[PDB]
Structures are given as structure tokens and as C-alpha cells.
Write a protein that binds this ligand. Structure first.
Ligand SMILES: Nc1ncnc2c1ncn2[C@@H]1O[C@H](CSCC[C@H](N)C(=O)O)[C@@H](O)[C@H]1O
Ligand SMILES: Nc1ncnc2c1ncn2[C@@H]1O[C@H](CSCC[C@H](N)C(=O)O)[C@@H](O)[C@H]1O
Ligand SMILES: COc1cc2c(cc1O)cc1c3c(cc(O)c(OC)c32)CCN1C
Ligand SMILES: COc1cc2c(cc1O)cc1c3c(cc(O)c(OC)c32)CCN1C
Lengths: 335, 335
């Protein structure tokens, strides 16, 4: 059976969830076989080859996002204390975790790089009224959404920079720089970390959170010709999954102070919550999307893409009870 | 059975090798249980706690050493291509490995920190006649031994600094700094790496080789009250076994370029060769030591200490076919 065949059935909703999960799990299983080496000697050779290679290198309506994601439309792994923790509670808990680990204090200047729909920006601005908080995003729609929310919440300490971070030039420095699930999209990491360091003083801290594998790094791309999934989710070679330790080798310009991971079940529960919420609001979602997309068929295509992303993410992050793919966090100071 | 009881039998040669190996293997097994955590989250918490803690902190006659060790009296893990590779061949192969990985080139100034009996110093000086090679050791006997060997080998490009490296002050810089199995003895690693960086220019490289565990760090000390071994081998708290990645968190002053490990079977074969050679030359060894030690009993004590070190090292490094304790190597440049 070809890719086209599987893709055809998928788009027609003719693959049941059980089979879909099974198929995607197997694709990730093959990635694990690709990434694990028989000896630590070989593991490090493999990992260093990857690190060396790095050193050489339409928008959805907000009503739809509100129908699929949690309250602040967080698009990153959340943190679930309990089995019954809601996605809204999990977003808040993860915002609080970042504030704790990045050592946020009232009065600081804070920059959130690739801030998305600005959940973290709004959380810090509300919690710490004397902080000034800047979000940076390359999306005009996201900028507009954040500014509207800040206005509704009576927050006067928020601004948003609309920029491609890789092109942004500024002399401005910040007490705290946060990068939540943006670094996976960065084509040139050494240059990225260097740029960030120029926006820090000797008193600043940099906090990065990124999806990872605990042992090895990989580009998010087809493992072989039987992998219909990877390229469906990201039709471009634009996402890298760093190992949990990969950024330790990018200390040219910043110096590590602390290092954590969060078990993958938290991310698994995040994507599960999104999937279930989308499913609950399926009819509403289809109504919202129809104007901007033009046909029920294009609508179905967008929904299938997002739903499959969640189904696949579930298998990826829940693999071996969260002990394969997970979330890495690091705290750095400037050199 | 108490420590005293086991120690008594050991000193009397009443513990057979099979039982001795079994006992020491069990001690290391308990260390593995202590060091491995159930989740990567917990593993990193454990490892970072260790790294944070670090950031707060009679000579044997040469004739005896010649009778127990290989030709250049290398006192570090060697490299064995084949089952029949001799200790002399393995010393040379490991010297060549260091030259390759540290990117030694003719004409460079080279500093070997804690150079021991100077095998590496003499190897580089002979292979690269336009290099100047300096060994640094805190032992006057080692300095004297190296200078004698340099004279016998018609080497004119060797000097030796007699110094405690932690106290040595100099404005001199070197193209290459090598640290082979010395860092395990360094009480203040952050300060050590900082000092090394002051002896480098922008063109220099620093190569470190250290005994490690692939996953976690530990002080070499009694795991519990049943551990007679650890404190027998090092009666002081003076040896730390860093994890294979521990030095990645010490890039305040230097920046990593490359990272390897060498499987533990090489070290296992090294200590095995020493043990077998000592055993072969047992009578001669006892004759050599008697003058300086004063009695057959003191002689037996020194021999038992060294032989047990080799027997225990065998169990440590061969554990799980070399995939627990092993040798880590890193290459760095100056910040
Ligand atoms: N070059 C670039 N400049 C700015 N933002 C970018 C970027 N490349 C990607 N991004 C944005 O980075 C974000 C990563 S998704 C995470 C969003 C937010 N930090 C959250 O946790 O919810 C996306 O919004 C993506 O579009
Ligand atoms: N503070 C210090 N200053 C200088 N040398 C030291 C030192 N602490 C330990 N050493 C020496 O460092 C050496 C580590 S043993 C390894 C010796 C040599 N590099 C080899 O590979 O054979 C020992 O000689 C030890 O006595
Ligand atoms: C679950 O695994 C991944 C998830 C995401 C990703 C890469 C992943 O591996 C990058 C995507 C993305 C988005 C929203 C979102 O909610 C996401 O889930 C966290 C992701 C929006 C677009 N870009 C940033
Ligand atoms: C095998 O495991 C270890 C070995 C050694 C060590 C710590 C170890 O864990 C430190 C000792 C030491 C010595 C000679 C020698 O040949 C050694 O074997 C490599 C060691 C001399 C004294 N100091 C440096």
C-alpha cells in the first residue's frame, strides 16, 4: 500500500482511531531504532555528527483556535498535576512553571520570543504589574490578538514586536528572555543563541523550553518511504527535535546554569485535550473555517491535518510512559 | 561480617580471586542502583544537584613501577585494538589517539597537566621534533624520571614544571593543553577550567580525558557500611568520577568543540595487563620495595593495595561489557 492510498483513506475519515494510532506509533518506533546506538561511544559519535551538521546550516481564525486549544491558546506542552486537570488549568500551571524556573521577578523587562497567541506574555504582565513584557512574533494576526487581549484585561505593560526574529536588529536589552517551543523552528541555532546574547546584559537570564528526545536529535521528516505521517504534518523540512542535551553544545555565547526535562505524558495530555476539544466542537469548527477556506473539502483537509497532528503527538510523547520524547528546559546567563 | 574481618582476610591473601572479584562487582552494582533514576526528569535533577555541589567546593621506586606498568609507565586507560595487543602497544595506541583528537601538529607548544611518568610528553616530543613539550607534575620523582628519559632518548624539546597545578601562576600560554586522567583529582573544577583558559590564546585547544560513568557522577567513596573497597583504594575523599557529560556544564571559560567516549573494556584490559604483569614479577617487586618500606609486611600491604585496585578496576570498567564506567574525552577552545 502506497502513501497515496493511506493518505486517501485518512482524508476520507476511513481510518479508525485505533488503526491510526497504531500506524503512527510504528513510525515513531522506527525513529527510535534509527536513533539509539549499541554503545555510548557510538551514541556520542551519532549525536556529535548531528550537532556538527547544525553548525554548518494562510492563518487560522482566532475563533477556530479558541474552539480547539485552551483558554489562552497555548501552543506548547502544558503541565498536568492530576488526571482531571483541565487544559485551562494545565496552561496556567505551565506558565507558573516557566515563571519559577526563569526566575521572573516584579520589575524586570521580559522578552518572549515567538510568543504565539501571547498566553505567557499576558500571564507575566498580569502577575507582575511592574514588569514590562514584550512579545515577539512574525504573525500580524497574533500581534493583533495579544494587543486586543491586553486591552480587555486592562494591562498597560505589554508591547508586541512584529518581526522575523532571525532578521530583527535592536540595541534593546532585557532582564529575561524566554523561548517556549520556538527553537525547534530555528534554522540556524548557533546564530540564534548569539543574537539572543546581544539582547542580554550581565544580569540577564535566558530560559529555553523545547520538545526533545531524551537521547538523540533528529529532523522531523520521513524515516523512510513508508512514512506518510512526518511530511503530512510538516510538508517542509522546518522542524528539528533536539536531544535533551543538544543545547549544552551551544554555549559559545551563553553559559548554562540549570537544566530540566518534563516527562512526555504532560505533552501527551496536552495534545489529547486539544484533540478531544476539537472533536467536541467539530460542527462549530467547520462552520468557522468555511468562509476563509471556500469549501467543506478544504475545511475537512485543515481539520484532518490538525486532528492527526494531535493523534500522532499523543503516540510520540506517550511512548514508553513519556520517557522517549519529552520537553527539555535550560536556564542560561550571558558569557 | 565486618569491614575489619574482610580487610584482615584480604591482607592475608585468604580471599581467592573469584570471591574478590564477586565482592567488588557487588559493590559497583550497588553504585549503579544509587545512580540510575526511574525517569529522565529525575536523572537530570540528580545530575544537576551533583554539578551544583561541585560549584560550591611516600613514592614508589621507578623500578617497581617499571615492573608493574607498561614501558612508559602510563597510568591511565590505554587502547587495545586486538585481544593480543600488549600493554606496551596499547600505551602507544592511546598516545596516538590523544594526538589525533587533540589535533597535535609539529611546531606547537604543548602542556601536559599532571603528566605522571611523562609517556605522552615523550611521545609527542619524539614524534614532533619542532614541538616544545612541557609536562607539569607535583612530584619531584616524576620530574626527575622524565628528564632522565628525555636525556636517554636524545630529546631536546622537553621541559618539566614541578608545581601543584592549583597553585601554579604563569603568564605563559600554550597552543595545546592536555589533561589525561588528572581532572578526577581536582577539588575545584570550575576554578581549574578557568585557570587553564588563562594559559590559552584564541588559537589554542584543550583536550581532557577522564574516567567517567556514562549516565551519572559520583565521588569515589563508600556506598554504605558494607563497602570495604572504596575507602581502601582511596582512603581520602580525593577522587570524583564525573558523568560522561558533566564537563558540558563547565563552559564558563572554554567552549566545547568535540566529545567522545571510549568503551570501558579498554580500561578493563589496561588494569588486567597491570595486574598480570605485577603477578608475573611478584618476587622481583617484593625485592624492590623491601628497602624503602622496611618489612615484608609493609611490602605485602602496598602490593595488596595495588593488586586490589586492578582487580576492582577490572570489575568496574568491564561491567556490562564496558557500557557503565568508561573514559570520556572532550576538546575545547577558549571562550
Ligand atoms: N523566525 C521567527 N520569528 C518569529 N516568530 C517565529 C519565527 N519562527 C517561528 N516563529 C513562531 O514561534 C512560535 C512557536 S509555537 C509556540 C508559541 C508560544 N511560545 C506558546 O508557547 O504557545 C510560532 O508562533 C511560530 O510561528
Ligand atoms: N594538584 C596537582 N598538581 C599537579 N599534578 C597533580 C595534581 N593532583 C594530581 N596530580 C597528578 O595527576 C596525575 C593523574 S594520573 C595520570 C598521569 C598521566 N597523565 C598518565 O596518563 O599516565 C598523577 O600523577 C597525580 O599525582
Ligand atoms: C506536539 O509536537 C509538535 C507540536 C507543534 C510543533 C512541533 C511538534 O513536534 C510546531 C507547530 C505547532 C503549532 C501548535 C501546536 O499546538 C503545536 O503543538 C505543541 C505545535 C503551530 C505551528 N508550529 C509552531
Ligand atoms: C582504574 O580506576 C582509577 C584508576 C586510577 C585513579 C582512579 C580510578 O578510578 C587515580 C590514581 C591512579 C594511579 C595509577 C593508575 O594506573 C591508576 O589507574 C588508571 C589510577 C596513581 C595515583 N592516582 C592518580
Amino acid at each position: 500500500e502506497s502513501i497515496g492510498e493511506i493518505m486517501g483513506k485518512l482524508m476520507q475519515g476511513e481510518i479508525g482511531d485505533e488503526e491510526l494510532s497504531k500506524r503512527i506509533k510504528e513510525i515513531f518506533g522506527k525513529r527510535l531504532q534509527w536513533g539509539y546506538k549499541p554503545t555510548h561511544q557510538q551514541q556520542l559519535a551519532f549525536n556529535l555528527d548531528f550537532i556538527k551538521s547544525l553548525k554548518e546550516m494562510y492563518e487560522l481564525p482566532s475563533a477556530f483556535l479558541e474552539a480547539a486549544f485552551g483558554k489562552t491558546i497555548k501552543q506548547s506542552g502544558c503541565y498536568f498535576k492530576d488526571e482531571t486537570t483541565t487544559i485551562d488549568e494545565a496552561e496556567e500551571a505551565s506558565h507558573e512553571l516557566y515563571c519559577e524556573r526563569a526566575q521572573i521577578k516584579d520589575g524586570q523587562t521580559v522578552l518572549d520570543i515567538g510568543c504565539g497567541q501571547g498566553g505567557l506574555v499576558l500571564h507575566i504582565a498580569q502577575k507582575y504589574k511592574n514588569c514590562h513584557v514584550t512579545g515577539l512574533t512574525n504573525s500580524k494576526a497574533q500581534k493583533n490578538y495579544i494587543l486586543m487581549q491586553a486591552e480587555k484585561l486592562q494591562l498597560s505593560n505589554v508591547d508586541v514586536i512584529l518581526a522575523d526574529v532571525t532578521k530583527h536588529e535592536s540595541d534593546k536589552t532585557y532582564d529575561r528572555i524566554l523561548v517556549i517551543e520556538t527553537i525547534e523552528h530555528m534554522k540556524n541555532i548557533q546564530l540564534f543563541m548569539k543574537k539572543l546574547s546581544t539582547w542580554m546584559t550581565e544580569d540577564s537570564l535566558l530560559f529555553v523550553d523545547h520538545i526533545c528526545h531524551k537521547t538523540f536529535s533528529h529532523h522531523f521528516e520521513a524515516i523512510d518511504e513508508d512514512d506518510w505521517y512526518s511530511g503530512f504534518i510538516f510538508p517542509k523540512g522546518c522542524v528539528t527535535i533536539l536531544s535533551a542535551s543538544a543545547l549544552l553544545y551551544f554555549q559559545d555565547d551563553v553559559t548554562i546554569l540549570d537544566h530540566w526535562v518534563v516527562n512526555g505524558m504532560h505533552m501527551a495530555r496536552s495534545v489529547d485535550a486539544w484533540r478531544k476539544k476539537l472533536d467536541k466542537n467539530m460542527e462549530l469548527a467547520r462552520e468557522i473555517l468555511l468562509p476563509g477556506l471556500g469549501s467543506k473539502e478544504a475545511v475537512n483537509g485543515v481539520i484532518t491535518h490538525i486532528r492527526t497532528f494531535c493523534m500522532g503527538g499523543y503516540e510520540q510523547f506517550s511512548y514508553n510512559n513519556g520517557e522517549e520524547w519529552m520537553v527539555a528546559q535550560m536556564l542560561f546567563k550571558k558569557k
